[PDB]
Every structure is written in C-alpha cells, then in structure tokens.
Amino acid sequence: TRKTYTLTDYLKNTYRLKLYSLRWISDHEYLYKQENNILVFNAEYGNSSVFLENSTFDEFGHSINDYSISPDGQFILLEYNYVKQWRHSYTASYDIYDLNKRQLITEERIPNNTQWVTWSPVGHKLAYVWNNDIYVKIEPNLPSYRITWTGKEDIIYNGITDWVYEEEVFSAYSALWWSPNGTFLAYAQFNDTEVPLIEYSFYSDESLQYPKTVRVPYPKAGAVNPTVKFFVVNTDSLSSVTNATSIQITAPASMLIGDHYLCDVTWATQERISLQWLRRIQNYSVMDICDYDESSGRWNCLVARQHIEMSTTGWVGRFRPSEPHFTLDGNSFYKIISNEEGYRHICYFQIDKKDCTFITKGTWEVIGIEALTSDYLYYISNEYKGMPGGRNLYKIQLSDYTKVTCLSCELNPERCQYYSVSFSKEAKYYQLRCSGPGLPLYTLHSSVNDKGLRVLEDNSALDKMLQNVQMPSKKLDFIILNETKFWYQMILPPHFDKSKKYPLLLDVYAGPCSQKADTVFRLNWATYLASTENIIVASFDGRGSGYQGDKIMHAINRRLGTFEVEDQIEAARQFSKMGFVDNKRIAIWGWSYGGYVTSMVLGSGSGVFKCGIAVAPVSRWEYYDSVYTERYMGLPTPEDNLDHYRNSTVMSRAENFKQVEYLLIHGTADDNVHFQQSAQISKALVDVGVDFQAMWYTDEDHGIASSTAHQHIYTHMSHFIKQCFSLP
Amino acid sequence: TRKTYTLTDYLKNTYRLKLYSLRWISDHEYLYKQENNILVFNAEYGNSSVFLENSTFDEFGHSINDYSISPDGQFILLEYNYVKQWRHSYTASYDIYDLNKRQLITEERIPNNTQWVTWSPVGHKLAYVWNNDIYVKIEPNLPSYRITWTGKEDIIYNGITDWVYEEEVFSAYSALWWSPNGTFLAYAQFNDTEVPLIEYSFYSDESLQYPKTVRVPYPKAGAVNPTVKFFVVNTDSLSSVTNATSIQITAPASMLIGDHYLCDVTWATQERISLQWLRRIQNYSVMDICDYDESSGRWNCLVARQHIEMSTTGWVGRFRPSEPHFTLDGNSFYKIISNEEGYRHICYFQIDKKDCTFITKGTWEVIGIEALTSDYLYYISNEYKGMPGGRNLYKIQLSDYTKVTCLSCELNPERCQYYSVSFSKEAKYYQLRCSGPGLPLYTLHSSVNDKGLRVLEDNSALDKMLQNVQMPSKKLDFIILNETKFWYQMILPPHFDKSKKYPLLLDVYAGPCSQKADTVFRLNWATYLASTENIIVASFDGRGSGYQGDKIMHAINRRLGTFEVEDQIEAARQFSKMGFVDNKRIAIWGWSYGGYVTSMVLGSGSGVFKCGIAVAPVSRWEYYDSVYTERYMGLPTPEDNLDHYRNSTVMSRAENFKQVEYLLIHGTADDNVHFQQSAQISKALVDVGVDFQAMWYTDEDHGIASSTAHQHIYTHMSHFIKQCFSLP
Numbered sequence A, B: 001t002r003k004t005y006t007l008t009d010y011l012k013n014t015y016r017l018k019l020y021s022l023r024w025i026s027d028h029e030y031l032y033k034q035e036n037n038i039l040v041f042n043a044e045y046g047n048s049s050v051f052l053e054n055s056t057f058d059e060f061g062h063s064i065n066d067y068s069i070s071p072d073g074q075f076i077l078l079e080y081n082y083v084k085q086w087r088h089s090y091t092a093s094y095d096i097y098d099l100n101k102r103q104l105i106t107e108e109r110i111p112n113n114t115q116w117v118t119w120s121p122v123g124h125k126l127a128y129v130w131n132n133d134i135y136v137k138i139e140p141n142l143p144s145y146r147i148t149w150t151g152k153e154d155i156i157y158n159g160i161t162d163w164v165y166e167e168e169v170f171s172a173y174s175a176l177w178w179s180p181n182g183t184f185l186a187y188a189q190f191n192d193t194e195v196p197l198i199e200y201s202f203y204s205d206e207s208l209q210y211p212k213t214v215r216v217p218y219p220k221a222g223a224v225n226p227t228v229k230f231f232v233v234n235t236d237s238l239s240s241v242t243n244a245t246s247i248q249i250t251a252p253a254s255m256l257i258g259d260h261y262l263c264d265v266t267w268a269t270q271e272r273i274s275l276q277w278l279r280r281i282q283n284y285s286v287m288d289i290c291d292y293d294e295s296s297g298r299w300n301c302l303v304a305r306q307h308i309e310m311s312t313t314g315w316v317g318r319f320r321p322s323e324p325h326f327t328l329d330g331n332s333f334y335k336i337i338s339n340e341e342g343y344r345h346i347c348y349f350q351i352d353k354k355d356c357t358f359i360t361k362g363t364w365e366v367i368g369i370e371a372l373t374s375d376y377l378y379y380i381s382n383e384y385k386g387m388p389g390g391r392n393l394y395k396i397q398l399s400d401y402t403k404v405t406c407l408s409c410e411l412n413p414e415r416c417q418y419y420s421v422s423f424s425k426e427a428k429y430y431q432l433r434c435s436g437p438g439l440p441l442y443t444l445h446s447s448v449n450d451k452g453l454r455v456l457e458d459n460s461a462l463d464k465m466l467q468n469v470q471m472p473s474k475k476l477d478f479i480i481l482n483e484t485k486f487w488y489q490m491i492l493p494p495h496f497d498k499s500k501k502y503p504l505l506l507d508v509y510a511g512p513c514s515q516k517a518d519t520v521f522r523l524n525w526a527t528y529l530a531s532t533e534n535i536i537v538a539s540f541d542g543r544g545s546g547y548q549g550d551k552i553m554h555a556i557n558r559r560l561g562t563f564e565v566e567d568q569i570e571a572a573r574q575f576s577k578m579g580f581v582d583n584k585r586i587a588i589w590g591w592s593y594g595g596y597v598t599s600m601v602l603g604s605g606s607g608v609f610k611c612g613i614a615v616a617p618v619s620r621w622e623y624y625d626s627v628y629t630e631r632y633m634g635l636p637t638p639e640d641n642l643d644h645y646r647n648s649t650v651m652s653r654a655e656n657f658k659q660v661e662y663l664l665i666h667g668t669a670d671d672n673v674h675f676q677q678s679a680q681i682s683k684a685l686v687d688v689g690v691d692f693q694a695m696w697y698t699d700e701d702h703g704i705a706s707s708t709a710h711q712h713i714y715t716h717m718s719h720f721i722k723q724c725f726s727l728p
C-alpha cells in the first residue's frame, strides 16, 4: 500500500516543489543560481557561464543573505546581517564588490543598519536610506551626498515608508523612485508626529531580564494618519552644488482639502513623472502628470493632464488605483480600470484627454499589464473558459485591438491553467511560470515568434516521488446562488467515494477581493488533512470576492462581517446538500481576515459548524489599521459608519460560542493584527462563561512563521481538528 | 441518594462558612457588624446595643466599601470609590461622620484618590497619604497639615510602600506608624528613582482603541532596589504658619555599608521606638532602640541598645525578622527567634543586654506572640501532640517558665486542632477561632480564670446543610525520608475504599516556609474533585517547608528548585506504591511558587506524573522580585549564586515535557509573577517541539480573581484533569 501525505511530510518539506528563479540582466541574458554558483544564461541558446563562483565569498566572514548586481554589471551589492522588520522592511549591512578589479570596496562603505538600498536603473549610482534620511553615491568608493536632514526615528521617514504605507499602500519598504536613466531621484516623506503608537511586550531570549516594549506608529481606524510630501532631486547636480534642492510636487487642491494618501509613483519619461493621490475616503483618486521645466528647475503638473478615477459602488482599484503603463514617448498610457459593467479592463489614455478607450472587454477581468512594446501589450487575465480562478498570458496588437492572441492557454491545457510571466528587459524573451492544476512548469519563450525555446523546470523529480504517495485530488466548480455563479474548490481524499459521508473543513479567507477557489497546485496542511485524515477541505468565493466584477466585489462595501460571512455558512449548507458530507462533522478555519470570518461564523448561531480555529483574527474593525479598514468601512464616526463598526465585532456574538468548540491562536508580537484583538475575544468569552481552547505564540508575529512555531501551530491545530472529528 | 459537593457548589459558594469578625474597642467591648448595622457588645455578659443603624447613610449617594470608627467612638470614616491597586494597595474617597452631632463633616474633606488613611491609636487624629505625601488632621473638620512635600508618583513614596515593600516586606500599603498615644507619627520614605520598570499591556474594556502600557517600578533579582529613609514627626507641635519638622532616624553603620531594607517598626513606649533593618543579603539584621530626647528634640539610638540577629544556615525570620513585644515600661521585650537547635522559640531580651533568655524550648515552634501582661505571655504554637500542622493557644507564667498552660488544646479536641486568637485591649478577654478539622467555631473567653464565656458562632446551619452532602474526609499522616518525618494530607473521596484504586492529584505550594498539610477545614476545588470526581487530592510538606525547624526549612537555602521539587516526586512515588492509588493516573498542580514546582516536577523526567497544571508559575528566578528571590537565592552574580539561578529554570527542562500533558495558565496583567515567566516557558516548549495546553486570562492579575475568570479557570482545569483521568 502507498503511504499518504502526512503531517510530517508537510512540516519537514519532504516533497519539495522546484522553482526556476531567474533574474533578467539584459534583453537576452539572465542570472540563475545553481549549486550556490551564480550562472549567466543566454536566453536564445540556453548556454551558460559562471558569472560568480560559489567560492568567491568563502573568506568574507559573514553569511551573505542576498546580492544585487548593478545594471551595468560593473558591481555587486552584497547583503548581510539581515534583520527582518515588518512584512517587507528589514535592516542590513552592505559591501560592494568591484567585478572588474575582482576586489571588495573598503572605503566610504554603506553604513551598518542601512534601511534600504537601490542601484539606479542604468549604470551604478546608489540611493540608500540610513537613520530615516536619503543618501546618494555616484560611485561605489566615493563619499555619499546627503539628500535629507529631517529623518527622525518613528517620526520622519525619508525614502522609506512608515508601518501603514509599507503594509497597505506600497507593499514595500522603499519610498524612492529613480527616473529611467537615473538623472532624478523621486521620493516620498512621511510624517508620523501625531500618529498614535501600538505598544506590546517583546520577551526576547530568556537571558533578557525585563521585557522590551515595542512602540510602533500605527493608525487604527479613524485615528490620526501619517501625512505625506513628495520630492524630486536632480542627482546629476550633486557633485556641482553644495546642497542640491529637493523640489516638492504638491498634491492637487482636490486632495489637499482633507486627509489623503500618495498611492502610486510611476516615471513616464526622463522628464515626466506620474503620481496618483487617493482621498482618505478611498472612492476618489487623482493622477497628476508632471513635467520638468528646465528654465525654472521646477516640476509642473498641467490640469489638462490630470485624470480622475472614482467609484460610486465601492473603493478605487482592487486594493488601490492601478499603475499606468506609459508608451515610450510618454504621451499616452494604459491602465486597468473598472468599465461601465464593473469589469476591470485595459483603458488607453492620451495624457491630455480625459476620456479613455477600452481595449479589452467582457465578463472577465484583466489581472495585470505585464509588458508594453511599440507593437504589443501583454497582459494576464482570467478570460479563458470563463474560469475566474485561472490565469493566462495574452498579447493584443496595438494597431488592431481585434487581434488578441492567448500565448499560454493551449500550451498544456490539462496541467497548466494558472500562469505568471517574467519578461526580459525589452520583452525579447519571456519566462512562463505555470503553477497549476498540475505540477509547476517553467518554460522559456522568444517574443519575436512566440516559440517555446525550452523547458527550464518541469518538476519531474517531484512527479516521480508523488507516484508512490496517495495524493488528494482537487475539484474546482461553482454553485448558482440568486442567478450568480459562485466558485468553490474541494481538496478531496484519495479514492473519493461520493456514496460515503466525509467530515468537512471550510478553509476561509473571504476578505474583499479574496480568491480561494483557483487552479493552483499546493502542498499544504489541507493536502495532509485530505490525504491522511480523509477530510474534505473546501473553500468558497462568495460576495466580496475578487476577479469577477464589482457587483460581486463591492457587495460588502461599508458592510464587512455581513454577506461574506453569510455566504460561507450557505456554502457549507450547499456542500451538505451534495450528499458526501457528514453534517455532524463540519469545521471552519482561517487566518487574519479568515480568522475574523471563522469567528463571525462560529458566533452566528447557525448550528452548521461543530468547531473552528481562528488564527490571528481581527475581532473589531476599530482595532485594525486605517488604510485597509476605512477602504471598505469608511470612518468610525456617528455621521459615517460607526453603527456598522459596532455591529460587526466578534465580541458581540460571545453567547453563541456556547454552541461550538473554538480554538483561538495569536502571536504576542503581531504588529499587524494586534494580540489585543484575540485578548478582547477571550475576555468576552470568559465574561459569558464560554469554555474554549487557546494558544499564544511568544514573540511570533502575524506569520507565526519561525521554523519551530510553524511546526507547533500546525501540530496543535491537527490535534484539535482530529479530536473534533473523533479521529484516532 | 444524597448529592455530592459539585464544581457549581464551589464556584457559586452554595455552602458558606459563617464567620464572627469582631473589632475590640476597649478591654471590655467589641464592635460586630450584624445585618449591615454595627453593634457594640459587652464581653462579660454578651449584651449589645446598636452603635450605628444601617439606615444612617441611606441618602449618602455612594456605595460604602468599608467603615472605620475612631478609637474614642466619636467619628466614623466612610470609605467609597474603592479602586484596587496591588495585593494590599488601593485608592478611595473618604467622608467623616460625627457620631455625637449626627452629621457628615463637609469642611476640609479628605481628598479623593487618597492612598492610605488611619486614625491615631487613641482619640481621633487622622494621618493620610495623597499624591505620595503625608497629611495630618488634628480634628476631622479642621485643615490638614502637610508633613511631606517630596511625594512623586512612581519615584518618592512618603508613608506608603512601593511595589516590593508592599508585597514582600510589610504585607501592607501603609508605611505610617503612630506612637501609642498619638503624639508622634513615624513614617518611611521610599525612593525608586533607579528601580527598573516592569512594563505590560492592559487591554481594558473593548471600547479602548489602543491598549495601555502599565509601568511599575519593580526590582527583579539582582537589579537596583529602592532606597529607604525613616522619620518621626511630632503631631502635637504642628503649625499653620511653619512647615512640620520631621526628625530622621538613620540606619546603623552595619546597614549603611551596602544595600539594606527597613523590615520592622514597633513602638515600645510613648517616647521609645524600635526599628529592624535587614541587609540585602538577608542573613543579617539589626534592631535599633531609639529614645526621644526632650531637650534636643532628637531621637537617639544607643549602640548599647542594638540587637543583632543573624543566620549561618539561611535567612533571618520565616519571611523577615519577627516583631518584638515590649513590656509596659519598654525596658525589655519578647521576640521569636531561631534557637541553637534551629527551632523558633520566644526569647526574652533586656534593651541594653546582648544575651537573651529562651522562655520556651522543644522540637516544635512558636507561631506568634499574641498578648503580653505583667504575669503572662500568650502565644500560638504547634506543640500539641507534636503535630506541626495544628495550632493552639498557650500562656506561659512569666515568673516561672515551667508553668505553661494550653488554653485551647482540650476545648474540643476532635473538632478543633487549629486556632487563632483575638485579645481585648489589655488581654482581659479573648476570642478563640477554631478553623478545623471540623467546622469553624468561634468562642469568647475571660483571661482571669480562662472561663469559656459563650459560643459566638458554631456553624450549626452549615453542619445541617452538609448532612445531606457526600463530603470528602481528610487524612493527615507522615512518611519517613532519611530518618525525618514529613507530613502529608489527603482529601479522600466519600465512602473511601482502600481496596479500590483512585486517581491522585498532587496539590503543591512547596515554597520556603510553606505548609500544605494541616488540620484546617476547607471548601475548595479539591473538595469537589474528591466528592464528585472521586479523585484523591494529596499535599506534602518536604524539605524547605515551615514550622518544623531550620534543618527542614533551610534545606533549600541558595538552592530553590532542588529538594522541594525532589521531595514532591518522592512523595508521589510513595503514594503511587499505596494500594489505593492508580499509578497510571497521578497528576500535579500548583499556583505561583506551586506553578514553578509543578513545572519543575513535570520537566524532571521522573515518569511518575501523567499530567499537570501550572497557574502563574515562576519560570526563572532572575524574573522574580529581589526581596523574595534573594532571601533564598542570594545574588545572581558569578561571585555569588548565578550558576544556581541558571540551572534552576523551567525552560532548561523543556525536552522532558514530551512525556507529559501540561496545561499552562497565566493572567496577562499579572504585576507579581509577570506573564513573561509563562511566555518564556511556552517559547522553550515550542522550541523543542513539545505540544501542550495553554490559557491566557486577559487583564487578570496574580489572583485570576474576577468572578468570571475564577469560574472560567476552574472550569477549564476541571475539563483538563477529567480528560487526563478518563473521567466523564
């Protein structure tokens, strides 16, 4: 008999998915790491050479965390002493290695505790952030030029984001943007002076006698937000003037009237920059297109070039307004926007004309614009077979919009329905990354003729290994609720027999624009639960879910904790109606937003669920951050949406937890969903006399991702689900 | 068939022990609160009068927390707006009611947020502390005189203790001591300037958007301690024009050489005060005897009147050097000290002579000195039948030490083996309080011929109720280890059958000077476990336990987490070999020091215990406070006892928890045993991949004593023990 996919298989990563992570260095070459050696590959022929031998830094004296080769290939940035901060941020030490001289640079070194470092996009200039101020080095061995003097820990951030902008706006720590040829350095400045601090204990190693109090400027819903300013400095003037001026570009009057955000920065040309601003009430955004005026040395944003993007049914964008993709001359751009039917499609704009032209349309959505050449625009969409959970690459002819080719749809239609892509520098080549429903498959292609050059990684070693394992299967389908198709997936036990009654675990995210029903192949906890424990692990995309139009996505506008919660309960009732589910053994679990939904479901009094697990849940919207929460909820004021903020807490449903078995889990150093959130749930349960199971994770954050805590949490949850389902 | 004593009976206090709490106001009368009315009783006859009608404050507009009648009976202090702080500390608002003129005083009121208030011992003067400064009111309607001006929140404490002195030295918030007739007011001043702060989150009600950080000056072992100064003010010479002069009494030179504590303040006469000082290395203490000098207005402490108390085997006193009991002229005193055999007995000292004379002797100990007349000294000891867990009242004839009479031994030997006493003002009468092995019994006696005047409360109503319940029994016996007898108790299920095998729960404290095997009658969680669940609840007093001499008590000197842990394992090993114990079902549980011991036992790798519960445990001695920890451990420095501090942690035993089921519980707002202690245990268990059960209690402190959390914790622990013992 074949073994199953066990909990230890998952926790020890016995069955490893092979990747093919390349780094394009030009229009025809990429870097790839093979046995710690950095190899340079010719895309056209597949032949390689050792770019940098694995032995090069044996006598360095520090474990190198990562590297970054300068665009001109003259230098290599070596990252070490990596200390993680939030989701994207960290600090590190850096050394620069001169590739020509084959020597490490020992003078004018990047300082220790550097927050961010980036090469210019051409050549080898560097911009870095140290002690919240920006510095620029024209040459790696030469002194830096200081750009800002206002940087102050927890107060003024120059060229780096504060907590909320990193997490919710930019999805990056960096707040600097070099112009295409590196002449200008644009940057944002955040002022957190009046932003309140979240404070929590950090216990550290057992040697630490007194716990440390971590204090982070974090605006919770309705609190004082950081303010922002935007500047542009001419780096070519640094060696000629004592103190080069940072020219401010002010937000438009329509934004200055109240609280707002800087939400996008995109250079159009060497002398033209676009900026998108978003009002704190996130249903109104403004794009400014600003040109360098050589005579005044100023940046001017013509009102004739200003573009408004607004929503009457919800917020702007999926999580924020989309980025524009400028044509080479910078006189026009493409941008994903919601059409009149509420479907996200590519619109083509002239910079000084307000009405745009849609180049795509249909009851499906464009996911992202991937590359733009003088003749073609390349994008990813879920158009294929009307499957919102699938992803394919398309090519549209710019001189004829009726000419749309699907580049990936038919490559391996059984194995591959979810693609991502990586284009070379001027889009001459593209790597396709298939992530499911079969094993991930990485292929290289030439853009000149769309021909498949070679298979880079097919995961054949893993396929051989899995043949000896009783693997679960995955069913992806839909149910029709009120004449609308709603997609679901099920991880089915091996030898799934529809005449048998199986226990069911509902795996929930269900946040706005979430998608849990897709074609991706995963080896995770659900793989184990279905394979070894014979549990069906189901997920459902209800109202509020993404990639299916605004009528679905905006259904939860101003009403989080309503339809998306009700639709999970309804999904479980629909799954019971299918005949292969034991109705006495239905459980629900989720993390973060999934934890909030799990808890809301468990407190609903539905009687559908026996048990559930909430990991790092939100419990009350006033505890979560301003940017994310207010996007869907508006402000927690009597004049706005306070009544709904108060009506959608987990705590108010405490009495209903008497009907279920609940497991509540949270990391004590969670800077994102504060431990406070679960501390308030537990107190409300204790207050009504509800028994439940709990687990805190000392010094773990939102990811509970340290090697030991990851194994501990999944082991603890596995025992809980098994006990709930009477499984030995 | 009769009911058992259930978990709800324990949680809802179905079966209540009646008390008889009286307050002596003279040598012949006492106050007793009956039906919210305050009565005055004549001790000789038992007749009473209403002192204060319950209706007097029906229109007060505030709920009265407590009352305090002035010594002369002219005024009543009304306490309201009570806000608990630590174990003893709190703030409240106060009003004074004139009993003669039948009116509330509205002039010069005691301020709100008052920290401590006390009447003088005679008359009706008041001393109070507000904003850390001392104030004196000569008359209730008159303005206060400000005594101190240096009071500063968390820094300077005048007349009130800081955290560590409150918890570990004085067992009180008060640091004020009126002279016997109220002329002088002595006070301590604490300086916490350089004491580090423990910081922890407080979540508060769900309405609080950002958690509060609580910051408390708390010296952990080896950290900077508070400093102390002592002063005496003459309250008869205060002026409305001039600031009060406080006379400082400095510590002796043997204390000033290094860190030290003020550990006892006891007035001897109207013009003589005794002070005890303790070195930070708590095996050396000095008593100073200080006399007022009428000519100079100074307090002089003659070197010839100094008394040294030291220990070569351990620390001084049970928890601190004992209090002296001065004679009427203050020329001599009686004090409990450890004799040459290591047994605590009464020594008689002359104020100006070094050698004291022991008035009691034997292999048993004096618990406390209770009253002193020119002819007799009254004390409690465990002499009777050589039972260290029993307590009786004795009197010793001061002119002939061979004449010792037991006053309580034979009153009711079957019902009463554990007594406490309350004497009237000049010891003319005494109230005996029997607390076990039978139901509590309160009696009143006259000292002249030791007549048993009357029964005050016999709990016959509870006895009638308990007749219909299947109550557990208590067995008190001993085991012999290395020629020494060590006592244990077992709470045995009703209808106990020695031919049956019962699961056993070891209930542990086992800290230095602990005593868990005694003759006290209790209605607690153990009563329910034995009565309803048929579990034997055992407790054992091994090495380090009290009231049996220093050979046993000092056995754990500089070695916490050694013999007391080994001895609990040895006792359970011996119990597991008894015919009526199921060796497959032995559990252990404890709170605080008992939580530490439970955890150390569970991590010992003994294999005797299936499971256990640690509530608010200490996990590493460096995390606990200086005063308690260093008393037994010395300093955590390489030159002193750092190696033992490092090898006595729970965290180092984490791998050994693989073979046990463990439940770890802690309140998040524990200011005493910081949540940090359990946060480090859980992290060590996660680090070694050991699964365990946990429960945090949001905003609960060391007591986990709110009505809802107390019910929740005992409910959660009951489910855990029942699951462990395969009980339905």
Ligand SMILES: CC#CCn1c(N2CCC[C@@H](N)C2)nc2c1c(=O)n(Cc1ccc(C#N)cc1)c1nccn21
Residues within 6 Å of the ligand: A167, A168, A319, A509, A511, A590, A591, A592, A593, A594, A618, A624, A628, A673, A703
């Ligand atoms: C509270 C909250 C929230 C919503 N949130 C956001 N957004 C957009 C990005 C920034 C972020 N602050 C908010 N992205 C995600 C969530 C979320 O809950 N989950 C569910 C989830 C989370 C963690 C794990 C794990 N491990 C598993 C499922 C998730 N899975 C894949 C992506 N996301």
Ligand SMILES: CC#CCn1c(N2CCC[C@@H](N)C2)nc2c1c(=O)n(Cc1ccc(C#N)cc1)c1nccn21
Residues within 6 Å of the ligand: B167, B168, B319, B509, B511, B591, B592, B593, B594, B618, B628, B673, B703
């Ligand atoms: C950490 C530690 C410790 C030692 N500690 C101290 N001392 C002397 C007084 C001041 C204090 N800081 C230290 N007194 C006690 C303890 C102790 O652990 N328990 C066991 C226990 C504690 C709480 C509960 C409850 N609920 C049950 C048992 C206890 N039961 C009755 C009195 N004590």
Ligand SMILES: *[C@@H]1O[C@H](CO)[C@@H](O[C@@H]2O[C@H](CO)[C@@H](O)[C@H](O)[C@H]2NC(C)=O)[C@H](O)[C@H]1NC(C)=O
Residues within 6 Å of the ligand: A040, A041, A042, A045, A047, A048, A049
């Ligand atoms: C991939 O192969 C090509 C062709 O064999 C290499 O290109 C160069 O070809 C010239 C012919 O004029 C040879 O003299 C050189 O060896 C090559 N130039 C360089 C700069 O190396 C090419 O280099 C190969 N690429 C890799 C990454 O190995």
Ligand SMILES: *[C@@H]1O[C@H](CO)[C@@H](O[C@@H]2O[C@H](CO)[C@@H](O)[C@H](O)[C@H]2NC(C)=O)[C@H](O)[C@H]1NC(C)=O
Residues within 6 Å of the ligand: A150, A156, A191, A192, A193, A194
């Ligand atoms: C960051 O914003 C704060 C206010 O949120 C600014 O601080 C004010 O600065 C002015 C001087 O121009 C003072 O007169 C005010 O007292 C300050 N207010 C507060 C609340 O501190 C600050 O200047 C901004 N800093 C930068 C570098 O823009």
Ligand SMILES: *[C@@H]1O[C@H](CO)[C@@H](O[C@@H]2O[C@H](CO)[C@@H](O)[C@H](O)[C@H]2NC(C)=O)[C@H](O)[C@H]1NC(C)=O
Residues within 6 Å of the ligand: A149, A150, A243
């Ligand atoms: C470079 O120029 C900036 C901008 O004028 C100077 O920043 C000013 O610094 C002084 C403090 O000495 C203050 O008066 C201003 O509030 C600052 N303004 C801004 C926008 O930061 C800066 O100090 C200059 N650096 C040098 C070396 O002269």
Ligand SMILES: *[C@@H]1O[C@H](CO)[C@@H](O[C@@H]2O[C@H](CO)[C@@H](O)[C@H](O)[C@H]2NC(C)=O)[C@H](O)[C@H]1NC(C)=O
Residues within 6 Å of the ligand: A181, A182, A183, A234, A236, A270, A271
């Ligand atoms: C990259 O772009 C900048 C901006 O267009 C170029 O700088 C301009 O170059 C022209 C020379 O052809 C001059 O007329 C301007 O004075 C320059 N402007 C500024 C603001 O510096 C720059 O030369 C380009 N760099 C490279 C390396 O090609």
Ligand SMILES: *[C@@H]1O[C@H](CO)[C@@H](O[C@@H]2O[C@H](CO)[C@@H](O)[C@H](O)[C@H]2NC(C)=O)[C@H](O)[C@H]1NC(C)=O
Residues within 6 Å of the ligand: B029, B040, B041, B042, B045, B047, B048, B049
């Ligand atoms: C208890 O009874 C005695 C009498 O046996 C009371 O003593 C008296 O005191 C009151 C005034 O307070 C007078 O009425 C009598 O003249 C006293 N008689 C004697 C013999 O002293 C006493 O008041 C009662 N005590 C209480 C507290 O009610």
Ligand SMILES: *[C@@H]1O[C@H](CO)[C@@H](O[C@@H]2O[C@H](CO)[C@@H](O)[C@H](O)[C@H]2NC(C)=O)[C@H](O)[C@H]1NC(C)=O
Residues within 6 Å of the ligand: B093, B109, B110, B111, B112
């Ligand atoms: C104790 O607190 C109360 C309430 O703050 C004070 O009582 C007065 O009550 C009303 C409202 O309850 C306030 O408007 C007044 O300011 C209060 N002042 C006076 C002078 O009556 C009270 O004064 C406080 N007591 C002391 C002794 O300070």
Ligand SMILES: *[C@@H]1O[C@H](CO)[C@@H](O[C@@H]2O[C@H](CO)[C@@H](O)[C@H](O)[C@H]2NC(C)=O)[C@H](O)[C@H]1NC(C)=O
Residues within 6 Å of the ligand: B150, B156, B191, B192, B193, B194
């Ligand atoms: C309380 O104790 C502190 C010492 O912890 C005394 O403060 C001063 O301490 C600093 C160092 O913290 C020294 O630089 C000074 O010389 C000390 N004395 C003075 C007069 O500044 C502090 O004075 C004490 N306070 C009281 C009211 O006794």
Ligand SMILES: *[C@@H]1O[C@H](CO)[C@@H](O[C@@H]2O[C@H](CO)[C@@H](O)[C@H](O)[C@H]2NC(C)=O)[C@H](O)[C@H]1NC(C)=O
Residues within 6 Å of the ligand: B181, B182, B183, B234, B236, B270, B271, B292, B294
């Ligand atoms: C309490 O004791 C004090 C001190 O013994 C008494 O005060 C002394 O009283 C006599 C008057 O009879 C004077 O000779 C002294 O000068 C006083 N000493 C001080 C230090 O003030 C006081 O009378 C007693 N109080 C009561 C109410 O009995």
Ligand SMILES: *[C@@H]1O[C@H](CO)[C@@H](O[C@@H]2O[C@H](CO)[C@@H](O)[C@H](O)[C@H]2NC(C)=O)[C@H](O)[C@H]1NC(C)=O
Residues within 6 Å of the ligand: B281, B283, B284, B310, B311, B312, B313, B634, B639
């Ligand atoms: C108080 O206890 C201390 C610690 O046990 C005793 O310390 C002596 O002095 C040093 C500590 O710095 C050690 O080197 C010695 O080993 C100790 N002497 C012994 C164990 O005899 C100190 O003697 C104690 N005081 C009394 C009065 O016994």
Ligand SMILES: *[C@@H]1O[C@H](CO)[C@@H](O)[C@H](O)[C@H]1NC(C)=O
Residues within 6 Å of the ligand: A093, A109, A110, A111, A112
């Ligand atoms: C970084 O830290 C190390 C260790 O303290 C030090 O020797 C070195 O000079 C530092 N590097 C820079 C660039 O300051």
Ligand SMILES: *[C@@H]1O[C@H](CO)[C@@H](O)[C@H](O)[C@H]1NC(C)=O
Residues within 6 Å of the ligand: A281, A283, A284, A310, A311, A312, A313, A634
């Ligand atoms: C933005 O949102 C607020 C709250 O829903 C609303 O009153 C306002 O009209 C909205 N703007 C648009 C363009 O719908």
Ligand SMILES: *[C@@H]1O[C@H](CO)[C@@H](O)[C@H](O)[C@H]1NC(C)=O
Residues within 6 Å of the ligand: B149, B241, B242, B243
């Ligand atoms: C008493 O002392 C305080 C504090 O030092 C001072 O401010 C006040 O002026 C003094 N009053 C008199 C009457 O000396």
Ligand code: NA
Residues within 6 Å of the ligand: B452, B453, B454, B455
């Ligand atoms: Na009698």
